[PDB]
Amino acid sequence: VDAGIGVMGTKLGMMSFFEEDGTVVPVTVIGFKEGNIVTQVKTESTDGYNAVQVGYERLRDRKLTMPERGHLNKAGVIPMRHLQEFRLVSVDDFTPSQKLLFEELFKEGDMVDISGTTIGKGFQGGIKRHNFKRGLMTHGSKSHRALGSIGAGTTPGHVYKGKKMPGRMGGTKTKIRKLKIMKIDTDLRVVMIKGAVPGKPGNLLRLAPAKI
Amino acid sequence: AVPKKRTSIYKKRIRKNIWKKKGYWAALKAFSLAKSLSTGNSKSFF
Amino acid sequence: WYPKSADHVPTDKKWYVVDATDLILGRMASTIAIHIRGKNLASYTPSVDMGAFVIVVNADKVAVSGKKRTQKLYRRHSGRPGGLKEETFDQLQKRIPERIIEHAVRGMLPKGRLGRYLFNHLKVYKGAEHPHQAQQPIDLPLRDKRI
Amino acid sequence: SSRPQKKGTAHHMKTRPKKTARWDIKRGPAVYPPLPPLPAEWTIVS
RNA sequence: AGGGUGAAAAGAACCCCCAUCGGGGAGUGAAAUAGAACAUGAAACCGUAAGCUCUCAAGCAGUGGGAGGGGGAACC
RNA sequence: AACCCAGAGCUAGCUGGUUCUCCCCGAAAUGCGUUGAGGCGCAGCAGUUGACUGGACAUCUAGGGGUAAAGCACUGUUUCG
RNA sequence: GGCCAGUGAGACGAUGGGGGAUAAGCUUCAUCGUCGAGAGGGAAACAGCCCGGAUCACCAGCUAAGGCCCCUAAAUGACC
RNA sequence: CGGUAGGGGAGCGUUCCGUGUUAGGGAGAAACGCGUGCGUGAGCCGCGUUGGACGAAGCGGAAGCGAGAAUGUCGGCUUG
RNA sequence: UCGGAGAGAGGCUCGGUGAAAUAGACAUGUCUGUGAAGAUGCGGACUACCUGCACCUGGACAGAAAGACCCUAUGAAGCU
RNA sequence: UUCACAUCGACGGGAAGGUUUGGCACCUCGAUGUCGGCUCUUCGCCACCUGGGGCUGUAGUAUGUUCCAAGGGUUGGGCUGUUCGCCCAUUAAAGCGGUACGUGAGCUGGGUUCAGAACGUCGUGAGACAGUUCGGUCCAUAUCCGGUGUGGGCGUUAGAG
RNA sequence: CGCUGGGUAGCCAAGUGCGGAGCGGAUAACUGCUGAAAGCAUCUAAGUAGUAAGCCCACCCCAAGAUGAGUGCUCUCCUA
Structure with a gap:
């Protein structure tokens, strides 16, 4: 569930916005390759919950399968690469046909929480995934940076599960909460959103008001 | 570091089969390269 | 000569129904799992699944005597340490009701490959209507004076 | 303590x-x- | 440590694949699936083909009961 | 306190090993002595064979003992007047 | 008596005791039981507790110790 | 008619010898298997193959005589 | 403190050659309980599709050497 | 101050724990690798600190004690090989434990149980002291269960996004 | 890469941004409210109120191999 419907943009680098007061604040910059359009709305009766399915990044028909283009076509909308729905407190008042929305809204809700696929760091070790420590680098020591011990002796008789081994670190989406919006420019349809948001510039970036 | 006990014939056949089969998948690729190298427009194999 | 052996029985197994509105949990679950096994059939055989589907309805209103309703706790333990999950019967019957009976019979009947296979023969529903009219389920016989 | 256990x-x-x-x-x-007695169970007489 | 083609080398003319390694015919021999890392050829171990079968499983893995199916038409 | 060969298959009351079928009977882990007590000798308890036997089990009656319990005559302690 | 063995630190349970701390699945002796050398059923699993003693076959029956709601046989049987 | 240590009784089997240059045997001696044939059992009768040369039974005799246990041992093979 | 980035050789994947110690057979779960008194092999409950590859090493009283500490042997040897 | 129980509780008694020192010696001598640190756990409470409460010889601020509470937290150093053995500076506090005195097929080897040597002492002597002192190569390319990641087949009963 | 200065991207931090919430429901200790057993009383026996970093939901990330394998809006072909 989320508080309200949200949009999804794209990370576009960062910069600073000199506040006229003369204080320096970092910002990132959110952009829309193609505009968010509703492409579905599901009720509590016809389906199990309530949500609106928005889409992003319009693309050529080739790039996209037949089940997709049929799904998009049924609602009478343009193509679109990315496609996600916001489950919404069951108050939906949306015609699933191309209610192109906008940021007439986030400037009022001056705190926004976004969902971004972080960047991916391969198969990282113990010392960095889980913030372990490391043995002495000198003094005859011979186990630096290694995961060290695992468990106890005969009784536990194995390694408690959920142990903090090494493994793959990044690549899964993450929120970031109560991150406040900041002076926006509708001619360029760009957002100047303070803070630092998941992902190197150019990944999809859900964007929806808080759930305080 | 040292194995306890020899594996069965059962298990070993399983893994050898995975080895060979891993060779199976990498033929039909070469067969595509063949069935394409039979004279045709292409920029490869001077 | 030779005792008869359960020879192939597929479907047309009797569907029964039990409205569990205030029927104490244990005793009911014994007479459910005795029709789940087939010990009411001269065709009884432990190794084959001669049983009969049944349907519990009103799975929210099973009664339990004594002070159970706040004492009995269902605990599911995660494999890792600290995973033990104290959980009292009132919280389940409030939260997910069908799991109650889904435990009761699941302890009654013989775990194994076969027991696991049969446990599907219990369909539990928290509403007051059951979507099965499969064999037009004839209500379930209770030989228990105390329920 | 002070009480033994039974093994x-x-x-x-x-x-x-x-x-x-x-x-x-x-x-x-x-x-x-x-249960007054029971007959024989076998007879060559035939 | 390393023995035993055949009774007689009659130890393989000729042909084809052919870097002359090794083979398939042809030929010899009673027989060469006896052909020269050749006489009977067990078991471990490596394959192949056919018959039935395993992916919600729990087991010193067999045993008593035997569902279903395949075999020559009650036994495996 | 070399190495090879020989006495030498040294010795080991110590460890390990001791393969085909069936049938009948079938123990002990106690005492004694032992430079002896994770050995051995004798007894004690198996097998099998030959004598002489008389029982074994239950019942009842005799005979001696100082144990359980009791007692303060004995010995030793023991509180109140 | 003859010809010949093996055995020589047993264990627990019951009882009467010593040692111990009327502690030990401790130790040490006396009288019995089971295990040792003995299966089977009850005891959830479980030498040393209970019934009981295994020549074999039987897709026959009656019981002992123990039991009769389900998993497993057998009354969710009577009355206080 | 349970049975370990152990004692006694009755047997099978293998290589070789006496009866033999035996009976039988290039229409074919042994290793592999179909026969729950047969035995209380060790094992025995039959039954088959590319090869293929010897050799039973009975009454007797002798033993380099019966194996999964020795961190045995010689050879061939695997697991990783 | 408090780590971090980098280059090289390994690791990793593909082509070629190709060992090892270990190994009763393993169809090789967790918790508790039991048990020669610290079990994947027994009991109850939970949990878990089959099978790969990389990575760590808590168990399999993991491998290695019939312990080198302790004791025994009417053992061996050295020194006084 | 009076007042047994705000607080301490003499004299004696009844328990639970299992971690100290021990008693037995049952498994393990064809081997179950010890103390202390490093890294990483996880669990218990009878609670040190944070959450709530009684009673107080609680005016308030501090407390003292008990009650429910393990969700969390539970420093940096100097000395010693040496977990309340300890002074320094803080800090909300700077807990006690179990996990083969957790963890050596993960690490160091400062100590102890190796061969050298010396001091005190015992022994006439070889040598010796659960006295001291200086030096003294702690081996490993995971078969299986376990765990962290990630795949493939196959199940999902037409096939797929 | 000889040794040095300087450095974009990347990866890092001693840099920067944010985060531990109106939360809501049951509770333990405790304080209660009405009130007899017991013609007073008592938080309790009937019934109800408040209330803890503790429990559950909420928060954030996976998740239908959840074999109980869910859901729906699109596709894909009935010529043998």
């Missing part, structure tokens, strides 16, 4: 099934009517 063999005498209600100890099986 194998010792544990058994405390905790084996005893039929400790004078009544059921007493009882005896049904007897029957004497």
Whole structure:
């Protein structure tokens, strides 16, 4: 569930916005390759919950399968690469046909929480995934940076599960909460959103008001 | 570091089969390269 | 000569129904799992699944005597340490009701490959209507004076 | 502490099934009517 | 440590694949699926083909009961 | 306190090993002595064979003992007047 | 008596005791039981507790110790 | 008619010898298997193959005589 | 403190050659309980599709050497 | 101050724990690798600190004690090989434990149980002291269960996004 | 890469941004409200109120191999 419907943009680098007061604040910059359009709305009766399915990044028909283009076509909308729905407190008042929305809204809700696929760091070790420590680098020591011990002796008789081994670190989406919006420019349809948001510039970036 | 006990014939056949089969998948690729190298427009194999 | 052996029985197994509105949990679950096994059939055989589907309805209103309703706790333990999950019967019957009976019979009947296979023969529903009219389920016989 | 525990063999005498209600100890099986005898079961006479 | 083609080398003319390694015919021999790392050829171990079968499983893995199916038409 | 060969298959009351079928009977882990007590000798308890036997089990009656319990005559302690 | 063995630190349970701390699945002796050398059923599993003693076959029956709601046989049987 | 240590009784089997240059045997001696044939059992009769040369039974005799246990041992093979 | 980035050789994947110690057979779960008294092999409950590859090493009283500490042997040897 | 129980509780008694020192010696001598640190756990409470409460010889601020509470937290150093053995500076506090005195097929080897040597002492002597002192190569390319990641087949009963 | 200065991207931090919430429901200790057993009283026996970093939902990330394998809006072909 989320508080309200949200949009999804794209990370576009960062910069600073000199506040006229003369204080320096970092910002990132959110952009829309193609505009968010509703492409579905599901009720509590016809389906199990309530949500609106928005889409992003319009693309050529080739790039996209037949089940997709049929799904998009049924609602009478343009193509679109990315496609996600916001489950919404069951108050939906949306015609699933191309209610192109906008940021007439986030400037009022001056705190926004976004969902971004972080960047991916391969198969990282113990010392960095889980913030372990490391043995002495000198003094005859011979186990630096290694995961060290695992468990106890005969009784536990194995390694408690959920142990903090090494493994793959990044690549899964993450929120970031109560991150406040900041002076926006509708001619360029760009957002100047303070803070630092998941992902190197150019990944999809859900964007929806808080759930305080 | 040292194995306890020899594996069965059962298990070993399983893994050898995975080895060979891993060779199976990498033929039909070469067969595509063949069935394409039979004279045709292409920029490869001077 | 030779005792008869359960020879192939597929479907047309009797569907029964039990409205569990205030029927104490244990005793009911014994007479459910005795029709789940087939010990009411001269065709009884432990190794084959001669049983009969049944349907519990009103799975929210099973009664339990004594002070159970706040004492009995269902605990599911995660494999890792600290995973033990104290959980009292009132919280389940409030939260997910069908799991109650889904435990009761699941302890009654013989775990194994076969027991696991049969446990599907219990369909539990928290509403007051059951979507099965499969064999037009004839209500379930209770030989228990105390329920 | 200060109390010992009851182990194998010792544990058994405390905790084996005893039929400790004078009544059921007493009882005896049904007897029957004497069932007057039964014929032969085989005959060459044919 | 390393023995035993055949009774007689009659130890393989000729042909084809052919870097002359090794083979398939042809030929010899009673027989060469006896052909020269050749006489009977067991077991471990390596394959192949056919018959039935395993992916919600729990087991010193067999045993008593035997569902279903395949075999020559009650036994495996 | 070399190495090879020989006495030498040294010795080991110590460890390990001791393969085909069936049938009948079938123990002990106690005492004694032992430079002896994770050995051995004798007894004690198996097998099998030959004598002489008389029982074994239950019942009852005799005979001596100082144990359980009791007692303060004995010995030793023991409180109140 | 003859010809010949093996055995020589047993264990627990019950009892009467010593040692111990009327502690030990401790130790040490006396009288019995089971295991040792003995299966089977009850005891959830479980030498040393209970019934009981295994020549074999039987897709026959009656019981002992123990038991009769389900998993497993057998009354969710009577009355206080 | 349970049975370990152990004692006694009755047997099978293998290589070789006496009866033999035996009976039988290039229409074919042994290793592999179909026969729950047969035995209380060790094992025995039959039954088959590319090869293929010897050799039973009975009454007897002798033993380099019966194996999964020795961190045995010689050879061939695996697991990783 | 408090780590971090980098280059090289390994690791990793593909082509070629190709060992090892270990190994009763393993169809090789967790918790508790039991048990020669610290079990994947027994009991109850939970949990878990089959099978790969990389990575760590808590168990399999993991491998290695019939312990080198302790004791025994009417053992061996050295020194006084 | 009076007042047994705000607080301490003499004299004696009844328990639970299992971690100290021990008693037995049951498994393990064809081997179950010890103390202390490093890294990483996880669990218990009878609670040190944070959450709530009684009673107080609680005016308030501090407390003292008990009650429910393990969700969390539970420093940096100097000395010693040496977990309340300890002074320094803080800090909300700077807990006690179990996990083969957790963890050596993960690490160091400062100590102890190796061969050298010396001091005190015992022994006439070889040598010796659960006295001291200086030096003294702690081996490993995971078969299986376990765990962290990630795949493939196959199940999902037409096939797929 | 000889040794040095300087450095974009990347990866890092001693840099920067944010985060531990109106939360809501049951509770333990405790304080209660009405009130007899017991013609007073008592938080309790009937019934109800408040209330803890503790429990559950909420928060954030996976998740239908959840074999109980869910859901729906699109596709894909009935010529043998």
